[PDB]
Amino acid sequence: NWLGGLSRAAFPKRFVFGTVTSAYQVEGMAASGGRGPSIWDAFAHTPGNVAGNQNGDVATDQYHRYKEDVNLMKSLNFDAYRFSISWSRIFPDGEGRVNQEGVAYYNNLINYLLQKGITPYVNLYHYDLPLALEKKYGGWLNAKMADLFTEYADFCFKTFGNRVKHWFTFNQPRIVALLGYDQGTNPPKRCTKCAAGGNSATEPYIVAHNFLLSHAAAVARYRTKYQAAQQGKVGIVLDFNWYEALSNSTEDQAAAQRARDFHIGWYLDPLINGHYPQIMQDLVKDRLPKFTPEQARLVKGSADYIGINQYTASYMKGQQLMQQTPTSYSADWQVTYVFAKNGKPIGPQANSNWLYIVPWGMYGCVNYIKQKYGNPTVVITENGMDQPANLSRDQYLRDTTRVHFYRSYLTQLKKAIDEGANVAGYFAWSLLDNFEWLSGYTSKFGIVYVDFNTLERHPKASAYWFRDMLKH
Ligand SMILES: OC[C@H]1O[C@@H](O[C@@H]2[C@@H](O)[C@H](O)O[C@H](CO)[C@H]2O)[C@H](O)[C@@H](O)[C@@H]1O
């Protein structure tokens, strides 16, 4: 059977199933409804930055169609919806004046979700820093972001927290640090060689540090001011792709572990244990900021659950650790990516070149967090795969590779849960085909097809697979 034995009965009682979008990727109305620009508006409007010079001005127009989309997710038997609030839709300048029209949109969305029995899981931030804050403060390079983010978070808790009980602060701070400040391919386009300036060996670490301090400050505000009345929870969303040693050699096993530490440990060791991973301290040395004891105690325990975005896996080959002149966060790992093992690729690729279909990576990541970090509460906050551009409607809808992807990855998640992993929920990226950052509209991640000419929605086979799997 096409469900492969999966159903709600195959997962723990009260396990949460949802779909995911983010504000810039789906809302549209980017320069309307009072919204101020984000760093992604400026970036996407610059020729050459995004495939086809496309942008999120209109995107899927969820802003005007949200009741259609909520009706659809309910019809597909989902329990929850993960979405984000655009900071610059609430505060066009990032601080100061509130855009009441923006507040009204999120109130309307939240209220309709609840009316339809869908639980809102709300991200405060999903790459979309208000442009005014980048220009005035230097964005995530500035420790003042903790104060600025906390004041924004405070407003959201006050305004929506009587209804919203499941929050996340950030989405994939590793990717902001890596692409924004190491490689310089996402805004603010900083790197050692970059026109905008930068330093690939130092800035990624400063940025990650400020995300951690900002998360901790916002959670301290929630706990001290809002939690007693509202009785909700706040977590953070981290990307984790699996790393598997190429061989059982000491050197290859060490490489795979180094990669895990530089990838997920970078955030999880602070959040769970109150310190950066030892290997990062040892290799990055004075380029890695030091938490004061007080800061470390604020960061430790500051996530009520850990959101993991899980997509893929890589083989890692080792090498003798060397003394080297620092060049970048990426080079600091001292690991060697390799394509294959025993003559076989790790898996076939989806449309995105980085996305190898490797269902056992889901088990790898979840089991690893269980065993290393004291089995914290984890929510799989994204998992999915993409189709290419230029297909026909019918070709998009017959998404048999995505059906197989979800069946296989969910079977591997189930394996980890059955072995005792404390996973509370699972969210598919994405509800809808949408604006996929540098790929623009050339990458289709949705379980629902969006025609970008007419904006019509059409559920794909994978949407009906979920409807069947999730029937109550
Ligand atoms: O790209 C699909 C969606 O997933 C997100 O980040 C991805 C990471 O999880 C993955 O590890 O790396 C790729 C490439 O760097 C990321 O795209 C985002 O949260 C979504 O916004 C994104 O559309």
Ligand SMILES: [Zn+2]
């Ligand atoms: Zn519209």
